[PDB]
Amino acid sequence: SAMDDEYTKLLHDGIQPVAAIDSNFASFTYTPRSLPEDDTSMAILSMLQDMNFINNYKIDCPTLARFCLMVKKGYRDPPYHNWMHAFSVSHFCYLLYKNLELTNYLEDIEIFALFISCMCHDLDHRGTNNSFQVASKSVLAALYSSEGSVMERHHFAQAIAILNTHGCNIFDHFSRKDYQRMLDLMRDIILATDLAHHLRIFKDLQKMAEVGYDRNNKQHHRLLLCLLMTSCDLSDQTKGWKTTRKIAELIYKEFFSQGDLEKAMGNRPMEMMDREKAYIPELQISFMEHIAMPIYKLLQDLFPKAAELYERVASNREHWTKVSHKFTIRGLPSNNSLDFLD
Numbered sequence: 001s002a003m004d005d006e007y008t009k010l011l012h013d014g015i016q017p018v019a020a021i022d023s024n025f026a027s028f029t030y031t032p033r034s035l036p037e038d039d040t041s042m043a044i045l046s047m048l049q050d051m052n053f054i055n056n057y058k059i060d061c062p063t064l065a066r067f068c069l070m071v072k073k074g075y076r077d078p079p080y081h082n083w084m085h086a087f088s089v090s091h092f093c094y095l096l097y098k099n100l101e102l103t104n105y106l107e108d109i110e111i112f113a114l115f116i117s118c119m120c121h122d123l124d125h126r127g128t129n130n131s132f133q134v135a136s137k138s139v140l141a142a143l144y145s146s147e148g149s150v151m152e153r154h155h156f157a158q159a160i161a162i163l164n165t166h167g168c169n170i171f172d173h174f175s176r177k178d179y180q181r182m183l184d185l186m187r188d189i190i191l192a193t194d195l196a197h198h199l200r201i202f203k204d205l206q207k208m209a210e211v212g213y214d215r216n217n218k219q220h221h222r223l224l225l226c227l228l229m230t231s232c233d234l235s236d237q238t239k240g241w242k243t244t245r246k247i248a249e250l251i252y253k254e255f256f257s258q259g260d261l262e263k264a265m266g267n268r269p270m271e272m273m274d275r276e277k278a279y280i281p282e283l284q285i286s287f288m289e290h291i292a293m294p295i296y297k298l299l300q301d302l303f304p305k306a307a308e309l310y311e312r313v314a315s316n317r318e319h320w321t322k323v324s325h326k327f328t329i330r331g332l333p334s335n336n337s338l339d340f341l342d
């Protein structure tokens with residue numbers, strides 16, 4: 001069996017030093033999607049070790065190895081919402097830890113919850129959004145639609161189901177209080193990945209940035225965790241143009257597949273999920289201006305060392321404007337034919 005051999009190696013071979021993964025592994029310039037997928041579970045362990053969580057929380061290595069593989073196995077393979085997304089999001093959490101001195105802002109257990117939440121935050125994603133669950137009358141909507149954030153509730157529930165699998169509860173030696181705290185943190189942080197939640201708390205984030213972070217304010221901790229989570233979730237926008245371009249391709253592949261399903265159900269998809277209407281450069285510029293850039297601006301406001309992240313997103317946004325003209329067909333198409341007009 002596959003998982004069994006992978007597990008055996010992960011547990012008995014030893015945790016590789018993080019520098020051995022890549023010389024620039026802890027840099028904001030590093031693109032974790034460059035790491036071969038077969039190397040990523042070891043990289044998770046290497047990051048957990050380097051952040052001192054294995055030692056600090058006395059995590060059982062067999063349990064942790066099993067847990068990491070179960071989380072990986074808990075992702076399906078849609079174009080974007082797959083394990084390499086969760087891996088890259090987790091990697092950015094590690095970058096925030098290594099570059100922004102999170103221990104001046106957050107409790108140890110909060111930073112640990114943030115990382116584990118990143119790993120788990122899109123578990124069992126099917127490549128469709130919350131609206132689709134309701135529209136298609138899915139099982140997930142049957143369970144959670146009365147509460148909202150249907151997919152995010154499912155991701156959290158899946159994380160808990162993994163913990164509740166024998167041999168996989170990396171927290172089961174925790175005190176009752178700490179165990180309760182960890183799972184509550186995972187709830188809040190994973191539910192924060194619904195962009196509707198982000199938009200709802202945005203004014204509160206603004207207020208916090210403007211008055212100044214108060215480490216003695218429990219609501220500030222909660223708000224900061226949400227902002228950091230979102231920052232990890234969108235972190236593909238903080239790399240180079242090539243990453244932003246590829247991830248646009250993956251996201252719209254996923255969106256358009258959902259739109260096709262909606263049309264087949266007799267429903268009119270959102271414009272951004274309709275391959276006949278969606279104009280990608282404008283949709284991506286809107287996403288960047290309306291969502292991504294303000295998030296990284298807030299991050300910069302709270303952490304001056306995060307300035308380069310905001311400048312990168314802004315740069316990538318400008319690059320969308322610069323390449324937009326290429327979506328207009330000038331001259332004849334590739335094949336010298338106007339057959340596509342029919």
Ligand SMILES: CNC(=O)c1ccc2nc(C)c3nnc(-c4ccccc4Cl)n3c2c1
Pocket residue numbers: 193195233234247248251272287
């Ligand atoms: C209503 N609009 C969108 O849900 C939407 C539109 C355009 C995006 N564009 C990009 C690059 C992106 N990256 N992550 C997300 C993302 C974040 C959280 C959940 C799901 C996704 Cl898909 N998004 C986009 C999201």
Ligand SMILES: [Mg+2]
Pocket residue numbers: 121122193194
């Ligand atoms: Mg999600």
Ligand SMILES: [Zn+2]
Pocket residue numbers: 085089121122193233
């Ligand atoms: Zn995500």
